Scaffold this active site. Sequence first.
Site, PDB file in Angstrom:
ATOM      1  N   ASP A   1      -0.421  -7.536   1.051  1.00 14.62           N
ATOM      2  CA  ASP A   1       0.115  -6.192   1.241  1.00 14.62           C
ATOM      3  C   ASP A   1       1.642  -6.236   1.225  1.00 14.62           C
ATOM      4  O   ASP A   1       2.288  -6.219   2.271  1.00 14.62           O
ATOM      5  CB  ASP A   1      -0.404  -5.569   2.538  1.00 14.62           C
ATOM      6  CG  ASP A   1      -0.137  -4.069   2.616  1.00 14.62           C
ATOM      7  OD1 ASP A   1      -0.519  -3.446   3.629  1.00 14.62           O
ATOM      8  OD2 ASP A   1       0.461  -3.512   1.669  1.00 14.62           O
TER       9      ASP A   1
ATOM     10  N   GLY B   1       2.637   5.837   9.296  1.00 14.91           N
ATOM     11  CA  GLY B   1       4.004   6.115   8.910  1.00 14.91           C
ATOM     12  C   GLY B   1       4.911   4.939   9.202  1.00 14.91           C
ATOM     13  O   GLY B   1       5.972   4.804   8.599  1.00 14.91           O
TER      14      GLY B   1
ATOM     15  N   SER C   1       4.071   2.042   8.469  1.00 17.66           N
ATOM     16  CA  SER C   1       3.764   1.114   7.374  1.00 17.66           C
ATOM     17  C   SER C   1       5.011   0.696   6.605  1.00 17.66           C
ATOM     18  O   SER C   1       5.863   1.527   6.296  1.00 17.66           O
ATOM     19  CB  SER C   1       2.763   1.739   6.405  1.00 17.66           C
ATOM     20  OG  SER C   1       1.476   1.816   6.990  1.00 17.66           O
TER      21      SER C   1
ATOM     22  N   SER D   1       1.708  -3.746   8.063  1.00 16.68           N
ATOM     23  CA  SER D   1       0.603  -3.510   7.138  1.00 16.68           C
ATOM     24  C   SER D   1      -0.375  -2.456   7.654  1.00 16.68           C
ATOM     25  O   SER D   1      -0.698  -1.495   6.955  1.00 16.68           O
ATOM     26  CB  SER D   1      -0.150  -4.806   6.843  1.00 16.68           C
ATOM     27  OG  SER D   1      -1.272  -4.546   6.014  1.00 16.68           O
TER      28      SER D   1
ATOM     29  N   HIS E   1       0.815  -1.209   0.000  1.00 11.03           N
ATOM     30  CA  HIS E   1       0.000   0.000   0.000  1.00 11.03           C
ATOM     31  C   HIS E   1       0.855   1.270   0.000  1.00 11.03           C
ATOM     32  O   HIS E   1       0.338   2.367  -0.169  1.00 11.03           O
ATOM     33  CB  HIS E   1      -1.015   0.004   1.154  1.00 11.03           C
ATOM     34  CG  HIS E   1      -0.421   0.305   2.496  1.00 11.03           C
ATOM     35  ND1 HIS E   1      -0.120  -0.677   3.416  1.00 11.03           N
ATOM     36  CD2 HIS E   1      -0.095   1.482   3.080  1.00 11.03           C
ATOM     37  CE1 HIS E   1       0.379  -0.117   4.505  1.00 11.03           C
ATOM     38  NE2 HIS E   1       0.401   1.192   4.329  1.00 11.03           N
TER      39      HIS E   1
END
Length: 198
Positions: free
Chosen positions: A63, A141, A143, A159, A36
């Site tokens: 993801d 952030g 992620s 994720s 993502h």
Amino acid sequence: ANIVGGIAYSINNASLCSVGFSVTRGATKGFVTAGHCGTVNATARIGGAVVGTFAARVFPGNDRAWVSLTSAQTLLPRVANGSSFVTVRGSTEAAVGAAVCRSGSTTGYQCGTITAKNVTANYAEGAVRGLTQGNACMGRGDSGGSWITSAGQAQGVMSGGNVQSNGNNCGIPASQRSSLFERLQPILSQYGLSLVTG
């Protein structure tokens, strides 16, 4: 730039995410991150400099992604822990109940335990399945960032999770946290990547 798990990078001069792990694909240098975080061909920057581009991704459903880096980048078998480092030693998957840590630009290095596997997240863009759940806290952030055991076994990449109005889930008890990561092993095999280890 030196590639270390957990550090910030930008995508197309807009979004901010965290590096997962340094990897190689034959002679090609790269890092794994969350899908993502960016679309194929999106430009990644660290410290304001272009370091590479998104080579492949799957999101939603899964993801996962990897960023193909220029040869000028320095791959390191490490994950950030404050000013210090955790050495990446392998990718043995830990069982439910195991202690695990994660590293990201927003909340830094946080620890907890693995609480469940094969969890489905229902994101705005669609479902992502097969995620592993921990109760280490995280924020927007983080992620793409590293999940790793203290013994250096890389687990996966951040994720998402149940962030609150303040943008993280640090302000609620561990028992109420759902912090979800994408397993590392299927990312490595899907893209034929090898983990940089020390």
